[PDB]
Design a protein around this ligand. Structure first.
Ligand SMILES: NS(=O)(=O)Oc1ccc2c3c(c(=O)oc2c1)CCCCC3
Ligand SMILES: [Zn+2]
Ligand SMILES: [Zn+2]
Length: 258
């Protein structure tokens, strides 16, 4: 039926509605450190979020995301394996039913408690809608979350989750600075991939940071209180909203660090 993350509408069923699910560059993938290739040509990432303008946070039934005003050339991502400028549009997370799983990408088969995705679109295509139709239309910055000390910058996000527990619930979320979610180092791995939820378009240049951010058990726990269902319906806890690793095929994962 409508795709989801359940046993009867989850990732293993998506290909029926979206044939590309079995494509040549699907995401996520497992990053093998034995085969990752250091590319001395890769430029450092350039992140300019000082002018980022958050608008609201919403539960869309697949996860929760914070939307940004992508009108002006405000918050942009450039450099790295990218050509041109990419505007930040929104960010969301993927997490598990327990600390031992939740991330989409894995490193040497290791799974993290959650994964943060900052989505950006290539300005040369005019708008977000037209970018998804191109192989270099989007750039998603992926950040792993491990359980440990608390991340101050994430507190504002977790404290507001109470008010958007069910699908359809939205809340104004202004003045949130995404810089507080970034790790110390910007070293990264990169490869061409796709969106990890339907429509699964292969229009993403993936940039996965090597350094995970630390979040407390208390913080991650609040993610698990959200629901997939809308208000006034069978309760189905929003947990394990991640897609398993997909076949690497003929792709090569490059590293910006030795
Ligand atoms: N893991 S992820 O960043 O690829 O997740 C997604 C998957 C699909 C979308 C889509 C849209 C978006 O804004 O963020 C997305 C993030 C809107 C329309 C394009 C396809 C669906
Ligand atoms: Zn080796
Ligand atoms: Zn995602």
């Amino acid at each position: 039926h409508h795709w989801g993350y359940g046993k009867h509408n989850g990732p293993e069923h998506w290909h029926k509605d979206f044939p590309i699910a079995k494509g040549e560059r699907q995401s996520p993938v497992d990053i093998d450190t034995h085969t990752a290739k250091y590319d001395p040509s890769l430029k450092p990432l350039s992140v300019s979020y000082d002018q980022a303008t958050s608008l609201r946070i919403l539960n869309n039934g697949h996860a929760f995301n914070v939307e940004f005003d992508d009108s002006q050339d405000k918050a942009v991502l450039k450099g790295g394996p990218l050509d041109g400028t990419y505007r930040l549009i929104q960010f969301h997370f993927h997490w598990g039913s327990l600390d031992g799983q939740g991330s989409e990408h894995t490193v040497d088969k290791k799974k993290y408690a959650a994964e943060l995705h900052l989505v950006h679109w290539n300005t040369k295509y005019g708008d977000f809608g037209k970018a998804v139709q191109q192989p270099d239309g989007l750039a998603v910055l992926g950040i792993f979350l491990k359980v440990g000390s608390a991340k101050p910058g994430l507190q504002k996000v977790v404290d507001v989750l109470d008010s958007i527990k069910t699908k359809g619930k939205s809340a104004d979320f202004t003045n949130f600075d995404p810089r507080g979610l970034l790790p110390e180092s910007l070293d990264y791995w990169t490869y061409p991939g796709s969106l990890t939820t339907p429509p699964l378009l292969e229009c993403v240049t993936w940039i996965v940071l090597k350094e995970p951010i630390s979040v407390s058990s208390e913080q991650v726990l609040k993610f698990r209180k959200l629901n997939f269902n809308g208000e006034g319906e069978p309760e189905e806890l929003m947990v394990d909203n991640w897609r398993p690793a997909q076949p690497l095929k003929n792709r090569q994962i490059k590293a910006s660090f030795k």
